[PDB]
C-alpha cells in the first residue's frame, strides 16, 4: 500500500530521523 505508506512514511522520519 505504497499510497497509505507515503502517508505514514513521511510522518515516521521525523521521529526517528531526528533522533
Known amino acids: 500500500p505504497m499510497a ?3 502517508k ?3 510522518k ?3 521521529k526517528i ?3
Do not use: G, M, P
Open 4 to 6: 497509505r505508506n507515503k
Open 8 to 10: 505514514l512514511l513521511k
Open 12 to 14: 515516521l522520519r521525523l
Open 17 to 19: 530521523a531526528f533522533k
